[PDB]
Amino acid sequence: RHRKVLRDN
Amino acid sequence: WSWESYLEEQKAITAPVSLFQDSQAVTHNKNGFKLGMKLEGIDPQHPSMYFILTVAEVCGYRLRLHFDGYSECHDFWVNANSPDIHPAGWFEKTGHKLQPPKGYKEEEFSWSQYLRSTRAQAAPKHLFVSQSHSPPPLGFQVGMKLEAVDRMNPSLVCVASVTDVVDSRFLVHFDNWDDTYDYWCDPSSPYIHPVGWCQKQGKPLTPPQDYPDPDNFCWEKYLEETGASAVPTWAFKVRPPHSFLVNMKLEAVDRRNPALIRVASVEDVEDHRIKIHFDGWSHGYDFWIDADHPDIHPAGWCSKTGHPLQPPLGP
């Protein structure tokens, strides 16, 4: 349910 | 309470029957589903997966399905003309995996043994609109690729695959993401596009999850390394916009209690979506729905099918 998010892992 | 009197008092109109799909409108079909009948069906939370389901309740042209072995809190309603359910045995004759009842292993399950143990009846074949015997969506083969809007992150158009084909529909999967993003489509779906659409549009294409050097994703290379073909461009059809107008009235399943169907109003419109308001209720409950969704109906649908209709909340 979390939106797509830019991460660094 | 009558539609006629209400439309009189509210100086309003119902959306005409001719604005709906035949399947949303049809009232003259008998519901032949019976309590305790067993069948196979898509899990609404995991649209790629098939489960054994039992008829738990019937109301007019609708039925409540229960996942065998699982909690009753997962029960869901469908219409009796749902394409998302299939007769017992369909999974094996059509290349689909069936999740066994909670506690079983996959090759420990057979229908003949399960019906013997439960002493249950399989829902008869003639009840099901979808048994994989109809014309397939021309041009859409399992394994072909395309671009698709992620409907859960709809600013993104993404690298996608056809993973399932059943009668006139096919299942869109987002490469290297999990199945929760999968959705069923037909060739006219406004959410899907041929390979190369994003770059013709000047729009960013979202590549598979964690793709190496995502900015320099190349369709031709990805197709070659996955041994895949693109869905051909001719297979994609234009869907014409719906002609629902603001303030037209209709009947809609309550999303908060899906056993209920309520008097509703068109609150807002897009090319392919309508925003529903439940007359008499807070606008906090208003919601967007695709015009082809199975849970909206013309006025009279409830009456003619034998389902209770919830009248507007009065003072």
Short mmCIF file of C-alpha atoms in Angstrom, two decimals:
data_model
loop_
_atom_site.label_atom_id
_atom_site.label_comp_id
_atom_site.label_asym_id
_atom_site.label_seq_id
_atom_site.Cartn_x
_atom_site.Cartn_y
_atom_site.Cartn_z
CA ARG A 1 0.00 0.00 0.00
CA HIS A 2 3.02 2.29 0.07
CA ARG A 3 3.30 4.33 -3.10
CA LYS A 4 6.29 3.95 -5.38
CA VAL A 5 9.09 5.98 -3.88
CA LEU A 6 12.66 6.74 -4.98
CA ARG A 7 15.03 5.02 -2.49
CA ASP A 8 18.75 4.12 -2.35
CA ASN A 9 18.51 0.45 -1.45
CA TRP B 1 -40.15 4.79 -1.88
CA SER B 2 -40.11 4.84 -5.69
CA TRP B 3 -37.62 6.06 -8.30
CA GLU B 4 -40.47 7.95 -10.08
CA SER B 5 -41.46 9.97 -7.00
CA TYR B 6 -37.85 10.64 -6.05
CA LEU B 7 -36.80 11.72 -9.60
CA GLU B 8 -40.05 13.93 -9.37
CA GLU B 9 -39.04 15.53 -6.04
CA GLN B 10 -35.40 15.97 -7.08
CA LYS B 11 -36.30 17.22 -10.64
CA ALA B 12 -33.63 14.81 -11.81
CA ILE B 13 -32.90 12.02 -14.34
CA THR B 14 -31.52 8.57 -14.21
CA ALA B 15 -28.65 7.76 -16.52
CA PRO B 16 -30.39 6.01 -19.47
CA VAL B 17 -29.96 2.22 -19.72
CA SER B 18 -28.25 2.80 -23.12
CA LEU B 19 -25.24 4.45 -21.39
CA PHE B 20 -24.39 1.22 -19.53
CA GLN B 21 -22.72 -1.93 -20.78
CA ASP B 22 -25.17 -4.82 -21.44
CA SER B 23 -23.68 -6.72 -18.47
CA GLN B 24 -24.33 -3.79 -16.08
CA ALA B 25 -27.88 -3.42 -17.32
CA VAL B 26 -29.19 -6.99 -17.77
CA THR B 27 -32.00 -7.87 -15.29
CA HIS B 28 -33.85 -10.74 -16.94
CA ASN B 29 -31.24 -13.49 -16.17
CA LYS B 30 -32.08 -15.83 -13.29
CA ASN B 31 -29.45 -16.34 -10.55
CA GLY B 32 -28.88 -20.07 -10.62
CA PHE B 33 -26.19 -19.99 -7.87
CA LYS B 34 -27.18 -21.80 -4.69
CA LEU B 35 -25.89 -21.83 -1.12
CA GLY B 36 -22.91 -24.17 -0.65
CA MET B 37 -22.09 -24.55 -4.36
CA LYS B 38 -18.30 -24.76 -4.98
CA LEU B 39 -16.32 -23.12 -7.80
CA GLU B 40 -13.02 -21.46 -8.76
CA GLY B 41 -12.36 -17.72 -8.83
CA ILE B 42 -9.90 -14.85 -8.88
CA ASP B 43 -8.87 -13.39 -5.52
CA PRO B 44 -9.87 -9.66 -5.78
CA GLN B 45 -6.72 -8.75 -3.75
CA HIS B 46 -4.40 -10.88 -5.91
CA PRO B 47 -5.97 -10.74 -9.41
CA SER B 48 -3.54 -13.30 -10.90
CA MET B 49 -4.42 -16.04 -8.39
CA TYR B 50 -7.27 -18.58 -8.38
CA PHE B 51 -8.89 -20.12 -5.29
CA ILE B 52 -11.61 -22.55 -4.36
CA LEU B 53 -14.71 -20.53 -3.47
CA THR B 54 -18.09 -21.49 -1.99
CA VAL B 55 -21.41 -19.66 -2.30
CA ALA B 56 -22.03 -18.22 1.22
CA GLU B 57 -25.05 -15.99 0.47
CA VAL B 58 -27.22 -15.00 -2.49
CA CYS B 59 -29.07 -11.71 -2.87
CA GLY B 60 -30.94 -11.08 -6.15
CA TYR B 61 -28.41 -11.27 -9.03
CA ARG B 62 -25.45 -11.12 -6.60
CA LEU B 63 -23.62 -13.72 -4.55
CA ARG B 64 -21.22 -13.73 -1.57
CA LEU B 65 -18.18 -15.99 -2.06
CA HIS B 66 -16.13 -17.49 0.72
CA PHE B 67 -12.52 -18.72 0.44
CA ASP B 68 -12.51 -22.36 1.54
CA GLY B 69 -10.25 -22.85 4.58
CA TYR B 70 -9.80 -19.11 5.14
CA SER B 71 -11.48 -16.56 7.37
CA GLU B 72 -14.96 -15.25 6.57
CA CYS B 73 -13.52 -11.69 6.73
CA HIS B 74 -12.20 -12.31 3.20
CA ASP B 75 -15.69 -12.97 1.71
CA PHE B 76 -16.58 -10.81 -1.29
CA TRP B 77 -19.58 -10.13 -3.53
CA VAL B 78 -19.78 -10.54 -7.31
CA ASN B 79 -22.66 -10.55 -9.79
CA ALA B 80 -23.93 -13.87 -11.18
CA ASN B 81 -22.61 -12.80 -14.59
CA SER B 82 -19.05 -12.28 -13.24
CA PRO B 83 -16.29 -13.36 -15.71
CA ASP B 84 -13.98 -13.65 -12.68
CA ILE B 85 -15.34 -17.01 -11.56
CA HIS B 86 -15.13 -20.44 -13.28
CA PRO B 87 -16.60 -24.00 -12.91
CA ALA B 88 -14.71 -26.64 -10.90
CA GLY B 89 -12.02 -28.26 -13.14
CA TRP B 90 -11.45 -25.11 -15.27
CA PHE B 91 -7.92 -24.47 -13.84
CA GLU B 92 -6.53 -27.84 -15.11
CA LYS B 93 -8.16 -27.69 -18.58
CA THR B 94 -6.90 -24.11 -19.18
CA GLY B 95 -3.35 -23.85 -17.73
CA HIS B 96 -4.13 -22.01 -14.47
CA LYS B 97 -2.75 -22.64 -11.02
CA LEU B 98 -5.30 -23.25 -8.33
CA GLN B 99 -4.45 -22.37 -4.74
CA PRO B 100 -5.74 -25.27 -2.58
CA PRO B 101 -7.91 -24.73 0.57
CA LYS B 102 -5.89 -23.42 3.55
CA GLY B 103 -3.78 -26.32 4.83
CA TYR B 104 -3.65 -28.43 1.61
CA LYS B 105 -0.62 -28.94 -0.67
CA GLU B 106 -1.07 -28.33 -4.45
CA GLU B 107 -0.82 -31.99 -5.66
CA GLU B 108 -2.71 -33.22 -2.55
CA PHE B 109 -5.82 -31.50 -4.07
CA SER B 110 -8.32 -32.99 -6.54
CA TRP B 111 -11.92 -31.88 -7.13
CA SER B 112 -13.33 -35.42 -7.12
CA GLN B 113 -11.65 -36.18 -3.76
CA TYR B 114 -12.58 -32.77 -2.31
CA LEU B 115 -16.29 -33.07 -3.27
CA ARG B 116 -16.33 -36.56 -1.77
CA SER B 117 -14.84 -35.27 1.53
CA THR B 118 -17.10 -32.23 1.74
CA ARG B 119 -20.16 -33.94 0.18
CA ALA B 120 -20.60 -30.64 -1.70
CA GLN B 121 -21.89 -29.86 -5.20
CA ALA B 122 -19.87 -27.98 -7.82
CA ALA B 123 -21.78 -25.06 -9.32
CA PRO B 124 -23.04 -26.31 -12.77
CA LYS B 125 -21.06 -25.17 -15.85
CA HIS B 126 -24.02 -23.43 -17.58
CA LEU B 127 -24.00 -20.70 -14.85
CA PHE B 128 -20.60 -19.25 -15.90
CA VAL B 129 -20.22 -16.60 -18.64
CA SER B 130 -16.43 -17.29 -18.68
CA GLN B 131 -15.16 -20.85 -19.27
CA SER B 132 -12.32 -20.03 -21.74
CA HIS B 133 -14.52 -21.04 -24.74
CA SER B 134 -15.01 -17.51 -26.23
CA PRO B 135 -12.97 -15.55 -28.85
CA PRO B 136 -9.64 -14.38 -27.31
CA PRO B 137 -8.54 -10.72 -27.40
CA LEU B 138 -7.15 -10.66 -30.93
CA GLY B 139 -3.45 -9.96 -30.89
CA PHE B 140 -2.79 -10.32 -27.14
CA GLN B 141 -0.78 -13.50 -26.46
CA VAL B 142 0.59 -14.58 -23.12
CA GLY B 143 4.21 -13.39 -22.85
CA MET B 144 3.84 -10.31 -25.08
CA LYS B 145 4.87 -6.91 -23.76
CA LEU B 146 3.30 -3.44 -23.77
CA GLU B 147 3.23 -0.18 -21.79
CA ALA B 148 0.63 0.24 -19.01
CA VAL B 149 -0.47 2.83 -16.45
CA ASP B 150 0.21 1.64 -12.91
CA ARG B 151 -3.34 2.23 -11.55
CA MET B 152 -1.93 2.33 -7.99
CA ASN B 153 0.65 5.01 -9.01
CA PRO B 154 -1.13 6.43 -12.04
CA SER B 155 1.46 9.10 -12.95
CA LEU B 156 3.60 6.12 -14.05
CA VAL B 157 3.38 4.36 -17.46
CA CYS B 158 5.48 1.22 -17.18
CA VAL B 159 7.03 -1.82 -18.87
CA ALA B 160 4.34 -4.55 -18.69
CA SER B 161 3.47 -8.06 -19.83
CA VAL B 162 0.45 -10.11 -20.71
CA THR B 163 0.49 -12.98 -18.18
CA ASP B 164 -2.99 -14.53 -18.57
CA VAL B 165 -5.64 -14.73 -21.28
CA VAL B 166 -9.23 -15.73 -20.55
CA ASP B 167 -12.00 -15.35 -23.12
CA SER B 168 -12.16 -11.70 -24.14
CA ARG B 169 -9.80 -10.41 -21.38
CA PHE B 170 -6.10 -10.58 -20.50
CA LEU B 171 -4.03 -9.87 -17.39
CA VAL B 172 -1.46 -7.04 -17.33
CA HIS B 173 1.61 -7.58 -15.04
CA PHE B 174 4.30 -5.01 -14.11
CA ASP B 175 7.66 -6.65 -14.81
CA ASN B 176 9.71 -7.36 -11.67
CA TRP B 177 7.06 -5.95 -9.29
CA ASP B 178 4.69 -8.17 -7.39
CA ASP B 179 1.24 -9.29 -8.58
CA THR B 180 -0.70 -6.81 -6.43
CA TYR B 181 -0.36 -4.37 -9.34
CA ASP B 182 -1.85 -6.82 -11.91
CA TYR B 183 -5.14 -5.90 -13.57
CA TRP B 184 -7.51 -7.44 -16.12
CA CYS B 185 -8.16 -5.57 -19.41
CA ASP B 186 -9.61 -5.88 -22.86
CA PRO B 187 -7.99 -4.48 -26.09
CA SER B 188 -9.82 -1.11 -25.69
CA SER B 189 -8.58 -0.45 -22.13
CA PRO B 190 -7.61 3.26 -21.83
CA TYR B 191 -4.77 2.23 -19.45
CA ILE B 192 -2.62 0.25 -21.91
CA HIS B 193 -0.44 1.27 -24.90
CA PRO B 194 1.81 -0.39 -27.46
CA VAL B 195 5.57 -0.68 -26.92
CA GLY B 196 6.99 2.73 -27.91
CA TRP B 197 3.99 4.88 -26.91
CA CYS B 198 5.78 6.78 -24.10
CA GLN B 199 8.57 7.97 -26.31
CA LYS B 200 6.22 9.03 -29.16
CA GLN B 201 4.32 11.00 -26.49
CA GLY B 202 7.51 12.50 -24.94
CA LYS B 203 6.55 10.84 -21.63
CA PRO B 204 8.96 9.06 -19.23
CA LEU B 205 8.75 5.25 -19.34
CA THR B 206 9.11 3.49 -15.98
CA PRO B 207 11.35 0.38 -16.56
CA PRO B 208 11.15 -2.91 -14.57
CA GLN B 209 12.01 -2.62 -10.89
CA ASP B 210 15.71 -2.15 -10.31
CA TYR B 211 16.53 -2.30 -14.05
CA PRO B 212 20.31 -1.59 -14.70
CA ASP B 213 20.78 2.02 -15.91
CA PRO B 214 16.97 2.77 -15.94
CA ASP B 215 17.32 6.01 -18.01
CA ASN B 216 18.81 4.09 -20.93
CA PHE B 217 16.21 1.32 -20.95
CA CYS B 218 15.74 0.20 -24.52
CA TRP B 219 12.67 -1.77 -25.64
CA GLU B 220 14.46 -3.59 -28.49
CA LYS B 221 17.20 -4.84 -26.13
CA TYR B 222 14.78 -5.83 -23.31
CA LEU B 223 12.60 -7.74 -25.80
CA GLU B 224 15.62 -9.65 -27.11
CA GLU B 225 17.01 -10.58 -23.68
CA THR B 226 13.56 -11.74 -22.42
CA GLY B 227 12.83 -13.66 -25.68
CA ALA B 228 9.61 -11.65 -25.93
CA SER B 229 7.55 -9.92 -28.66
CA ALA B 230 5.60 -6.65 -28.36
CA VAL B 231 1.77 -6.79 -28.58
CA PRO B 232 1.18 -5.53 -32.17
CA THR B 233 -0.16 -1.96 -32.51
CA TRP B 234 -3.22 -3.05 -34.54
CA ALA B 235 -4.52 -5.06 -31.52
CA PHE B 236 -5.06 -1.91 -29.45
CA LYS B 237 -8.57 -0.47 -29.92
CA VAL B 238 -9.96 2.96 -29.03
CA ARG B 239 -12.66 2.99 -26.36
CA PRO B 240 -15.16 5.81 -26.88
CA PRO B 241 -15.79 8.11 -23.86
CA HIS B 242 -18.86 7.40 -21.75
CA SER B 243 -21.83 9.79 -22.04
CA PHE B 244 -22.79 9.98 -18.35
CA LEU B 245 -23.43 13.62 -17.36
CA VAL B 246 -23.25 15.29 -13.95
CA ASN B 247 -26.41 14.87 -11.79
CA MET B 248 -27.73 11.77 -13.64
CA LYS B 249 -28.93 9.23 -11.08
CA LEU B 250 -28.29 5.44 -10.92
CA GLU B 251 -27.65 2.54 -8.51
CA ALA B 252 -24.22 1.80 -6.98
CA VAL B 253 -22.80 -0.87 -4.65
CA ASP B 254 -21.58 0.73 -1.35
CA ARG B 255 -17.80 0.25 -1.11
CA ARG B 256 -17.93 0.58 2.71
CA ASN B 257 -20.56 -2.17 3.04
CA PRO B 258 -20.59 -4.04 -0.30
CA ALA B 259 -23.70 -6.04 0.67
CA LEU B 260 -25.57 -2.72 0.09
CA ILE B 261 -26.61 -0.94 -3.09
CA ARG B 262 -27.60 2.72 -2.72
CA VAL B 263 -29.32 5.49 -4.72
CA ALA B 264 -26.44 7.43 -6.36
CA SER B 265 -25.66 10.52 -8.42
CA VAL B 266 -22.99 11.40 -10.96
CA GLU B 267 -20.96 13.99 -9.03
CA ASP B 268 -18.18 14.52 -11.63
CA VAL B 269 -16.97 12.91 -14.91
CA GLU B 270 -13.84 12.14 -16.96
CA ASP B 271 -13.53 10.44 -20.40
CA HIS B 272 -13.69 6.95 -18.86
CA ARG B 273 -14.55 7.47 -15.19
CA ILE B 274 -17.47 8.76 -13.11
CA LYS B 275 -17.42 10.10 -9.57
CA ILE B 276 -20.28 8.61 -7.54
CA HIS B 277 -22.13 10.38 -4.73
CA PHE B 278 -24.59 8.60 -2.45
CA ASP B 279 -27.68 10.88 -2.18
CA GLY B 280 -28.34 11.82 1.45
CA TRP B 281 -24.77 11.10 2.58
CA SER B 282 -21.59 13.09 3.25
CA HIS B 283 -19.47 13.99 0.21
CA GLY B 284 -16.59 12.41 2.16
CA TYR B 285 -17.89 9.06 0.83
CA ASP B 286 -17.82 10.14 -2.86
CA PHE B 287 -15.60 7.99 -5.12
CA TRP B 288 -14.18 7.57 -8.63
CA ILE B 289 -15.05 4.40 -10.56
CA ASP B 290 -14.44 3.23 -14.16
CA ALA B 291 -17.59 3.54 -16.30
CA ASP B 292 -17.37 -0.22 -17.10
CA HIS B 293 -17.11 -1.35 -13.45
CA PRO B 294 -19.51 -4.25 -12.67
CA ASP B 295 -20.90 -2.49 -9.52
CA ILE B 296 -22.82 0.40 -11.12
CA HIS B 297 -26.29 -0.12 -12.60
CA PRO B 298 -29.24 1.75 -14.07
CA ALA B 299 -32.19 2.70 -11.89
CA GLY B 300 -34.55 -0.26 -11.53
CA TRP B 301 -31.74 -2.84 -11.48
CA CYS B 302 -32.26 -3.75 -7.80
CA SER B 303 -36.06 -3.86 -8.14
CA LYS B 304 -35.96 -6.07 -11.24
CA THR B 305 -33.25 -8.44 -9.87
CA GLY B 306 -34.72 -8.84 -6.35
CA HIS B 307 -31.99 -6.91 -4.47
CA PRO B 308 -32.91 -4.35 -1.76
CA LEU B 309 -32.16 -0.77 -2.79
CA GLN B 310 -31.10 1.68 -0.06
CA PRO B 311 -33.10 4.89 -0.43
CA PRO B 312 -31.41 8.27 0.19
CA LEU B 313 -30.73 9.15 3.82
CA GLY B 314 -33.71 11.36 4.81
CA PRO B 315 -33.83 14.10 7.51
#
